[PDB]
Design a protein around this ligand. Structure first.
Ligand SMILES: Nc1nc2c(ncn2[C@@H]2O[C@H](COP(=O)(O)O[C@H]3[C@@H](O)[C@H](n4ccc(=O)[nH]c4=O)O[C@@H]3CO)[C@H]3CC(O)(O)C[C@H]32)c(=O)[nH]1
Ligand SMILES: O=[P-]([O-])[O-]
Length: 395
Protein backbone atom coordinates (compact mmCIF):
# COMPACT_ATOMS: atom_id res chain seq x y z
CA UNK A 1 0.00 0.00 0.00
CA UNK A 2 1.97 3.07 -1.33
CA UNK A 3 1.22 6.51 0.23
CA UNK A 4 -0.10 7.79 -3.16
CA UNK A 5 -2.52 4.72 -3.24
CA UNK A 6 -3.75 5.64 0.27
CA UNK A 7 -4.22 9.29 -0.94
CA UNK A 8 -6.21 8.07 -3.98
CA UNK A 9 -8.50 6.07 -1.62
CA UNK A 10 -8.79 9.09 0.73
CA UNK A 11 -9.84 11.49 -2.10
CA UNK A 12 -12.21 8.87 -3.68
CA UNK A 13 -14.27 8.84 -0.39
CA UNK A 14 -13.92 12.65 0.26
CA UNK A 15 -16.75 15.18 -0.42
CA UNK A 16 -14.25 17.98 -1.28
CA UNK A 17 -10.84 17.47 -2.94
CA UNK A 18 -8.41 20.42 -3.35
CA UNK A 19 -5.75 19.54 -5.98
CA UNK A 20 -2.13 20.58 -5.22
CA UNK A 21 0.06 20.55 -8.32
CA UNK A 22 3.73 19.86 -7.56
CA UNK A 23 7.13 19.33 -9.18
CA UNK A 24 8.44 16.41 -7.12
CA UNK A 25 9.25 13.48 -9.46
CA UNK A 26 10.43 11.06 -6.75
CA UNK A 27 12.85 10.37 -3.95
CA UNK A 28 12.55 11.75 -0.45
CA UNK A 29 10.75 15.04 -1.43
CA UNK A 30 7.85 13.18 -3.11
CA UNK A 31 7.57 10.59 -0.30
CA UNK A 32 7.73 13.32 2.34
CA UNK A 33 5.00 15.39 0.59
CA UNK A 34 2.77 12.27 0.24
CA UNK A 35 3.29 11.32 3.93
CA UNK A 36 2.36 14.92 5.01
CA UNK A 37 -0.78 14.70 2.81
CA UNK A 38 -1.89 11.21 4.11
CA UNK A 39 -1.61 12.60 7.70
CA UNK A 40 -3.55 15.77 6.81
CA UNK A 41 -6.32 13.80 4.97
CA UNK A 42 -6.71 11.33 7.92
CA UNK A 43 -7.59 14.23 10.32
CA UNK A 44 -10.12 15.85 7.94
CA UNK A 45 -13.81 14.69 7.76
CA UNK A 46 -14.10 13.91 4.00
CA UNK A 47 -12.02 17.03 3.05
CA UNK A 48 -8.85 16.04 1.24
CA UNK A 49 -5.82 17.33 -0.69
CA UNK A 50 -4.94 15.46 -3.89
CA UNK A 51 -1.28 16.04 -4.80
CA UNK A 52 -0.84 15.82 -8.60
CA UNK A 53 2.71 15.28 -9.89
CA UNK A 54 3.20 17.49 -12.98
CA UNK A 55 6.82 16.39 -13.63
CA UNK A 56 9.64 18.67 -12.51
CA UNK A 57 9.25 22.36 -11.66
CA UNK A 58 9.58 23.50 -15.32
CA UNK A 59 6.92 20.94 -16.35
CA UNK A 60 4.75 22.27 -13.52
CA UNK A 61 5.00 25.95 -14.67
CA UNK A 62 4.16 24.74 -18.23
CA UNK A 63 1.19 22.73 -16.88
CA UNK A 64 -0.12 25.86 -15.01
CA UNK A 65 0.39 27.93 -18.22
CA UNK A 66 -1.80 25.36 -20.02
CA UNK A 67 -4.36 25.50 -17.13
CA UNK A 68 -4.72 29.29 -17.53
CA UNK A 69 -5.13 28.86 -21.32
CA UNK A 70 -7.81 26.14 -20.57
CA UNK A 71 -9.50 28.20 -17.80
CA UNK A 72 -9.20 25.39 -15.16
CA UNK A 73 -6.54 25.95 -12.45
CA UNK A 74 -5.91 23.65 -9.45
CA UNK A 75 -6.65 24.90 -5.89
CA UNK A 76 -2.96 25.01 -4.96
CA UNK A 77 0.42 24.71 -6.68
CA UNK A 78 4.07 24.99 -5.86
CA UNK A 79 5.61 28.22 -7.22
CA UNK A 80 8.96 29.94 -7.22
CA UNK A 81 8.85 33.71 -6.50
CA UNK A 82 9.27 34.52 -10.24
CA UNK A 83 6.22 32.17 -10.95
CA UNK A 84 4.25 34.13 -8.30
CA UNK A 85 5.19 37.45 -10.10
CA UNK A 86 3.87 35.94 -13.38
CA UNK A 87 0.61 34.63 -11.85
CA UNK A 88 0.09 38.08 -10.30
CA UNK A 89 0.14 39.76 -13.79
CA UNK A 90 -3.15 37.74 -14.30
CA UNK A 91 -4.40 38.51 -10.72
CA UNK A 92 -4.72 34.68 -10.43
CA UNK A 93 -3.63 34.29 -6.73
CA UNK A 94 -5.53 34.76 -3.43
CA UNK A 95 -3.69 36.77 -0.78
CA UNK A 96 -2.81 34.19 1.90
CA UNK A 97 -3.77 36.36 4.94
CA UNK A 98 -7.27 36.73 3.30
CA UNK A 99 -7.75 32.94 4.04
CA UNK A 100 -6.81 33.67 7.67
CA UNK A 101 -3.56 31.64 7.53
CA UNK A 102 -1.30 33.07 10.27
CA UNK A 103 2.27 33.77 9.04
CA UNK A 104 3.85 35.04 12.29
CA UNK A 105 6.85 32.80 12.96
CA UNK A 106 7.67 32.15 9.26
CA UNK A 107 11.39 33.00 8.64
CA UNK A 108 11.58 36.55 7.22
CA UNK A 109 14.18 35.27 4.60
CA UNK A 110 11.25 33.29 3.17
CA UNK A 111 8.26 35.51 4.01
CA UNK A 112 9.85 38.65 2.38
CA UNK A 113 10.25 36.58 -0.80
CA UNK A 114 6.47 35.86 -1.18
CA UNK A 115 5.39 39.49 -0.40
CA UNK A 116 4.38 41.49 -3.55
CA UNK A 117 3.40 45.15 -3.08
CA UNK A 118 3.24 44.39 0.71
CA UNK A 119 0.84 41.44 0.29
CA UNK A 120 1.80 37.81 0.90
CA UNK A 121 0.77 35.56 -2.02
CA UNK A 122 2.55 32.30 -1.15
CA UNK A 123 3.30 30.10 1.84
CA UNK A 124 6.94 28.97 2.05
CA UNK A 125 6.78 25.19 2.03
CA UNK A 126 9.87 23.39 0.66
CA UNK A 127 12.65 25.96 0.83
CA UNK A 128 16.28 24.81 0.23
CA UNK A 129 19.68 26.42 0.65
CA UNK A 130 22.91 25.49 -1.06
CA UNK A 131 25.45 23.69 1.13
CA UNK A 132 28.93 22.33 0.74
CA UNK A 133 28.75 18.56 0.41
CA UNK A 134 32.12 16.91 0.90
CA UNK A 135 33.97 13.62 1.24
CA UNK A 136 35.18 13.52 4.84
CA UNK A 137 37.38 10.46 4.21
CA UNK A 138 39.16 12.02 1.21
CA UNK A 139 39.84 15.29 3.06
CA UNK A 140 41.15 13.38 6.15
CA UNK A 141 43.28 11.08 3.93
CA UNK A 142 45.16 14.16 2.48
CA UNK A 143 45.11 16.39 5.60
CA UNK A 144 42.91 19.01 3.88
CA UNK A 145 40.68 21.13 6.18
CA UNK A 146 37.12 21.86 5.10
CA UNK A 147 37.52 25.13 3.17
CA UNK A 148 36.07 28.22 4.81
CA UNK A 149 36.95 30.64 1.97
CA UNK A 150 36.69 30.58 -1.81
CA UNK A 151 40.51 30.85 -1.90
CA UNK A 152 40.85 27.83 0.39
CA UNK A 153 38.17 26.00 -1.66
CA UNK A 154 40.10 26.43 -4.94
CA UNK A 155 43.43 25.51 -3.22
CA UNK A 156 41.84 22.38 -1.69
CA UNK A 157 40.27 21.33 -5.04
CA UNK A 158 43.68 21.70 -6.78
CA UNK A 159 45.61 19.81 -4.03
CA UNK A 160 43.10 16.93 -3.87
CA UNK A 161 42.69 16.69 -7.69
CA UNK A 162 46.52 16.42 -8.04
CA UNK A 163 46.71 13.81 -5.17
CA UNK A 164 43.80 11.70 -6.57
CA UNK A 165 44.46 12.19 -10.34
CA UNK A 166 40.94 13.43 -11.13
CA UNK A 167 38.84 16.63 -10.73
CA UNK A 168 37.34 16.46 -7.21
CA UNK A 169 35.03 19.51 -7.32
CA UNK A 170 31.85 18.26 -9.13
CA UNK A 171 29.28 20.68 -10.47
CA UNK A 172 26.29 20.94 -12.77
CA UNK A 173 26.93 23.71 -15.37
CA UNK A 174 23.72 25.52 -14.47
CA UNK A 175 22.33 28.83 -13.27
CA UNK A 176 22.08 27.49 -9.66
CA UNK A 177 25.78 26.56 -9.39
CA UNK A 178 26.82 29.80 -11.16
CA UNK A 179 24.76 31.83 -8.58
CA UNK A 180 26.97 30.47 -5.73
CA UNK A 181 30.19 31.74 -7.38
CA UNK A 182 28.60 34.94 -8.74
CA UNK A 183 27.14 36.01 -5.39
CA UNK A 184 30.33 35.23 -3.45
CA UNK A 185 32.47 37.16 -5.95
CA UNK A 186 30.29 40.25 -5.12
CA UNK A 187 27.82 39.83 -7.98
CA UNK A 188 24.36 41.40 -8.18
CA UNK A 189 21.79 40.57 -10.87
CA UNK A 190 20.12 44.03 -10.76
CA UNK A 191 21.99 47.31 -11.34
CA UNK A 192 19.83 50.47 -11.04
CA UNK A 193 16.73 48.30 -11.69
CA UNK A 194 18.23 46.62 -14.78
CA UNK A 195 18.95 42.89 -15.15
CA UNK A 196 22.67 42.47 -15.92
CA UNK A 197 23.99 38.94 -16.77
CA UNK A 198 27.42 40.08 -18.13
CA UNK A 199 28.92 42.10 -15.22
CA UNK A 200 32.59 41.71 -14.33
CA UNK A 201 31.54 39.40 -11.45
CA UNK A 202 29.46 37.22 -13.76
CA UNK A 203 32.46 36.85 -16.06
CA UNK A 204 34.79 36.18 -13.13
CA UNK A 205 32.40 33.46 -11.80
CA UNK A 206 32.02 31.72 -15.20
CA UNK A 207 35.82 32.10 -15.84
CA UNK A 208 36.56 30.43 -12.43
CA UNK A 209 34.42 27.44 -13.38
CA UNK A 210 35.86 27.16 -16.91
CA UNK A 211 39.43 27.49 -15.57
CA UNK A 212 38.68 24.77 -12.94
CA UNK A 213 37.62 22.40 -15.80
CA UNK A 214 40.74 23.33 -17.83
CA UNK A 215 43.08 22.99 -14.79
CA UNK A 216 41.65 19.57 -13.92
CA UNK A 217 40.08 20.34 -10.49
CA UNK A 218 36.41 20.93 -11.55
CA UNK A 219 34.28 18.10 -13.03
CA UNK A 220 31.16 19.02 -15.04
CA UNK A 221 28.22 16.64 -14.33
CA UNK A 222 25.96 16.51 -17.39
CA UNK A 223 23.85 13.39 -16.76
CA UNK A 224 21.76 13.21 -13.58
CA UNK A 225 22.27 14.74 -10.16
CA UNK A 226 25.74 14.88 -8.67
CA UNK A 227 24.81 12.32 -5.99
CA UNK A 228 23.67 9.97 -8.85
CA UNK A 229 27.25 10.16 -10.29
CA UNK A 230 29.20 9.33 -7.07
CA UNK A 231 31.44 6.23 -7.34
CA UNK A 232 32.86 7.29 -10.72
CA UNK A 233 36.16 9.00 -9.97
CA UNK A 234 37.33 10.80 -6.86
CA UNK A 235 34.88 13.25 -5.30
CA UNK A 236 35.74 15.83 -2.63
CA UNK A 237 33.14 18.56 -2.90
CA UNK A 238 29.99 19.84 -4.45
CA UNK A 239 27.81 22.92 -3.89
CA UNK A 240 24.24 21.67 -4.07
CA UNK A 241 20.78 22.07 -2.68
CA UNK A 242 20.09 20.90 0.83
CA UNK A 243 16.94 19.23 -0.62
CA UNK A 244 19.37 16.54 -1.95
CA UNK A 245 20.72 15.78 1.56
CA UNK A 246 19.07 12.36 2.06
CA UNK A 247 19.92 11.36 -1.61
CA UNK A 248 23.60 12.11 -0.89
CA UNK A 249 23.43 10.19 2.43
CA UNK A 250 21.88 7.14 0.65
CA UNK A 251 24.36 7.25 -2.34
CA UNK A 252 27.71 8.05 -0.66
CA UNK A 253 29.97 5.01 -0.06
CA UNK A 254 32.31 7.37 1.88
CA UNK A 255 31.63 9.38 5.08
CA UNK A 256 29.53 12.32 3.81
CA UNK A 257 30.18 15.74 5.24
CA UNK A 258 28.04 18.87 5.14
CA UNK A 259 29.57 22.26 5.76
CA UNK A 260 28.54 25.87 5.39
CA UNK A 261 29.60 27.45 2.10
CA UNK A 262 33.01 28.96 1.54
CA UNK A 263 32.82 32.75 1.71
CA UNK A 264 35.11 35.61 0.63
CA UNK A 265 36.62 35.64 4.18
CA UNK A 266 36.38 33.54 7.35
CA UNK A 267 34.30 36.44 8.85
CA UNK A 268 31.15 34.88 7.36
CA UNK A 269 30.00 31.83 5.42
CA UNK A 270 29.34 32.18 1.67
CA UNK A 271 25.85 33.06 0.51
CA UNK A 272 23.85 30.14 -0.71
CA UNK A 273 21.04 30.26 -3.33
CA UNK A 274 17.55 29.71 -1.94
CA UNK A 275 15.54 27.29 -4.07
CA UNK A 276 12.41 25.14 -3.59
CA UNK A 277 8.93 26.49 -3.60
CA UNK A 278 6.02 28.25 -1.99
CA UNK A 279 2.40 27.12 -2.06
CA UNK A 280 -0.07 29.43 -3.79
CA UNK A 281 -3.88 29.36 -3.76
CA UNK A 282 -5.70 30.22 -7.00
CA UNK A 283 -8.66 32.67 -6.98
CA UNK A 284 -10.64 30.35 -9.32
CA UNK A 285 -10.93 27.77 -6.47
CA UNK A 286 -14.43 27.28 -4.90
CA UNK A 287 -15.01 28.56 -1.31
CA UNK A 288 -15.05 24.86 -0.17
CA UNK A 289 -11.68 24.13 -1.95
CA UNK A 290 -10.22 27.37 -0.51
CA UNK A 291 -11.17 26.27 3.06
CA UNK A 292 -9.33 22.95 2.47
CA UNK A 293 -6.33 25.04 1.26
CA UNK A 294 -6.53 27.18 4.46
CA UNK A 295 -6.49 24.05 6.71
CA UNK A 296 -3.73 22.38 4.63
CA UNK A 297 -1.55 25.55 4.75
CA UNK A 298 -1.94 25.81 8.57
CA UNK A 299 -0.97 22.10 8.75
CA UNK A 300 2.11 22.64 6.48
CA UNK A 301 3.21 25.54 8.72
CA UNK A 302 2.78 23.44 11.95
CA UNK A 303 6.00 22.66 13.76
CA UNK A 304 5.50 18.85 13.52
CA UNK A 305 4.78 18.90 9.76
CA UNK A 306 7.83 21.14 9.19
CA UNK A 307 10.00 18.99 11.49
CA UNK A 308 9.10 15.66 9.74
CA UNK A 309 9.34 17.16 6.22
CA UNK A 310 12.67 18.99 6.78
CA UNK A 311 14.32 15.98 8.53
CA UNK A 312 13.11 13.58 5.76
CA UNK A 313 14.63 15.79 3.03
CA UNK A 314 17.17 18.49 3.93
CA UNK A 315 14.79 21.30 3.24
CA UNK A 316 15.12 24.25 5.64
CA UNK A 317 12.29 24.35 8.26
CA UNK A 318 10.42 27.54 7.40
CA UNK A 319 9.22 28.47 10.94
CA UNK A 320 10.89 29.23 14.23
CA UNK A 321 8.44 26.70 15.84
CA UNK A 322 9.79 23.77 13.76
CA UNK A 323 13.22 24.12 15.38
CA UNK A 324 11.62 23.81 18.82
CA UNK A 325 9.69 20.64 17.90
CA UNK A 326 10.99 17.52 19.71
CA UNK A 327 11.05 15.38 16.54
CA UNK A 328 13.28 18.02 14.84
CA UNK A 329 15.42 18.19 18.03
CA UNK A 330 15.79 14.38 18.14
CA UNK A 331 17.04 14.26 14.47
CA UNK A 332 19.39 17.26 15.03
CA UNK A 333 20.81 15.78 18.23
CA UNK A 334 21.83 12.54 16.30
CA UNK A 335 22.93 14.28 13.10
CA UNK A 336 24.74 17.67 13.12
CA UNK A 337 24.07 18.18 9.38
CA UNK A 338 20.54 19.50 10.11
CA UNK A 339 21.92 22.37 12.23
CA UNK A 340 24.50 22.99 9.45
CA UNK A 341 21.65 23.42 6.93
CA UNK A 342 19.87 25.88 9.30
CA UNK A 343 23.12 27.84 9.92
CA UNK A 344 23.69 28.09 6.15
CA UNK A 345 20.04 29.27 5.70
CA UNK A 346 21.01 32.50 7.61
CA UNK A 347 23.29 33.42 4.63
CA UNK A 348 20.81 33.24 1.81
CA UNK A 349 20.28 35.05 -1.50
CA UNK A 350 17.53 34.82 -4.10
CA UNK A 351 17.59 35.25 -7.85
CA UNK A 352 15.46 37.98 -9.34
CA UNK A 353 11.67 37.66 -8.98
CA UNK A 354 11.04 38.87 -12.59
CA UNK A 355 8.08 37.11 -14.24
CA UNK A 356 10.41 36.15 -17.18
CA UNK A 357 13.13 34.75 -14.89
CA UNK A 358 12.31 31.02 -15.38
CA UNK A 359 12.91 31.40 -19.13
CA UNK A 360 16.04 33.55 -18.57
CA UNK A 361 17.67 31.29 -15.96
CA UNK A 362 17.33 28.09 -18.11
CA UNK A 363 17.14 29.11 -21.81
CA UNK A 364 19.47 32.21 -21.71
CA UNK A 365 21.78 32.25 -18.63
CA UNK A 366 21.91 28.40 -18.29
CA UNK A 367 22.69 28.09 -22.03
CA UNK A 368 25.54 30.68 -21.75
CA UNK A 369 27.04 28.73 -18.84
CA UNK A 370 26.76 25.43 -20.81
CA UNK A 371 28.37 27.16 -23.88
CA UNK A 372 31.38 28.25 -21.74
CA UNK A 373 31.78 25.07 -19.70
CA UNK A 374 30.90 22.33 -22.27
CA UNK A 375 31.75 24.05 -25.63
CA UNK A 376 34.70 26.30 -24.45
CA UNK A 377 32.88 29.55 -25.37
CA UNK A 378 34.67 32.68 -24.12
CA UNK A 379 32.90 33.49 -20.81
CA UNK A 380 32.45 37.26 -21.58
CA UNK A 381 31.26 36.48 -25.17
CA UNK A 382 28.75 33.80 -23.86
CA UNK A 383 27.39 36.18 -21.17
CA UNK A 384 27.26 39.13 -23.65
CA UNK A 385 25.01 36.96 -25.85
CA UNK A 386 22.90 36.12 -22.76
CA UNK A 387 22.64 39.81 -21.87
CA UNK A 388 21.44 40.68 -25.40
CA UNK A 389 18.85 37.85 -25.40
CA UNK A 390 17.58 38.89 -21.89
CA UNK A 391 17.43 42.62 -22.92
CA UNK A 392 15.43 41.55 -26.03
CA UNK A 393 13.06 39.37 -23.95
CA UNK A 394 12.49 42.10 -21.26
CA UNK A 395 12.03 45.07 -23.68
N1 LIG B 1 11.23 25.93 -12.72
C1 LIG B 1 12.12 26.61 -11.95
N2 LIG B 1 13.12 25.92 -11.36
C2 LIG B 1 14.00 26.60 -10.63
C3 LIG B 1 13.92 28.02 -10.42
N3 LIG B 1 14.95 28.34 -9.60
C4 LIG B 1 15.62 27.20 -9.29
N4 LIG B 1 15.04 26.16 -9.90
C5 LIG B 1 15.38 24.79 -9.85
O1 LIG B 1 15.26 24.40 -8.49
C6 LIG B 1 15.98 23.18 -8.37
C7 LIG B 1 16.39 23.05 -6.94
O2 LIG B 1 15.17 22.94 -6.24
P1 LIG B 1 15.11 22.23 -4.81
O3 LIG B 1 13.74 22.13 -4.31
O4 LIG B 1 16.09 22.82 -3.82
O5 LIG B 1 15.67 20.73 -5.10
C8 LIG B 1 14.90 19.81 -5.90
C9 LIG B 1 15.87 18.91 -6.59
O6 LIG B 1 16.99 19.63 -7.12
C10 LIG B 1 16.31 18.00 -5.46
N5 LIG B 1 16.85 16.66 -5.81
C11 LIG B 1 16.07 15.59 -6.15
C12 LIG B 1 16.73 14.37 -6.40
C13 LIG B 1 18.13 14.20 -6.27
O7 LIG B 1 18.82 13.10 -6.46
N6 LIG B 1 18.84 15.22 -5.90
C14 LIG B 1 18.24 16.39 -5.66
O8 LIG B 1 19.05 17.24 -5.34
O9 LIG B 1 15.13 17.83 -4.71
C15 LIG B 1 14.21 18.85 -5.00
C16 LIG B 1 12.93 18.26 -5.57
O10 LIG B 1 13.19 17.63 -6.84
C17 LIG B 1 17.23 23.41 -9.25
C18 LIG B 1 17.54 22.31 -10.15
C19 LIG B 1 17.63 22.95 -11.56
O11 LIG B 1 16.75 22.18 -12.35
O12 LIG B 1 19.00 23.12 -12.08
C20 LIG B 1 17.10 24.32 -11.50
C21 LIG B 1 16.85 24.58 -10.08
C22 LIG B 1 12.82 28.68 -11.09
O13 LIG B 1 12.65 29.92 -11.04
N7 LIG B 1 11.99 27.94 -11.84
O1 LIG C 1 39.91 18.93 -23.78
P1 LIG C 1 39.06 18.44 -24.90
O2 LIG C 1 37.78 17.88 -24.36
O3 LIG C 1 38.72 19.61 -25.77
Amino acid sequence: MKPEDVIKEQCARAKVVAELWHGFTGGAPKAALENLVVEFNKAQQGRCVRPVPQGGYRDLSTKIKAAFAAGKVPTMAQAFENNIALYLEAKALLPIESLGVKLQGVNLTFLNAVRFGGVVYGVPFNKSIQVLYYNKDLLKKHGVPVPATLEEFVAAAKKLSRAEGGPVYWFQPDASTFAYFFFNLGGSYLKDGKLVLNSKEAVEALTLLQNGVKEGWAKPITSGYINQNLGSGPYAFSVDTSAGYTAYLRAAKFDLGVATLPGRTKGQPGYGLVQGTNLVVFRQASKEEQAVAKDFLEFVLSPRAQAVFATATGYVPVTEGALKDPVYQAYAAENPDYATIVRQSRYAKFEPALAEWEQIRFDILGQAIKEAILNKADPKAALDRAQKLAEDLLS
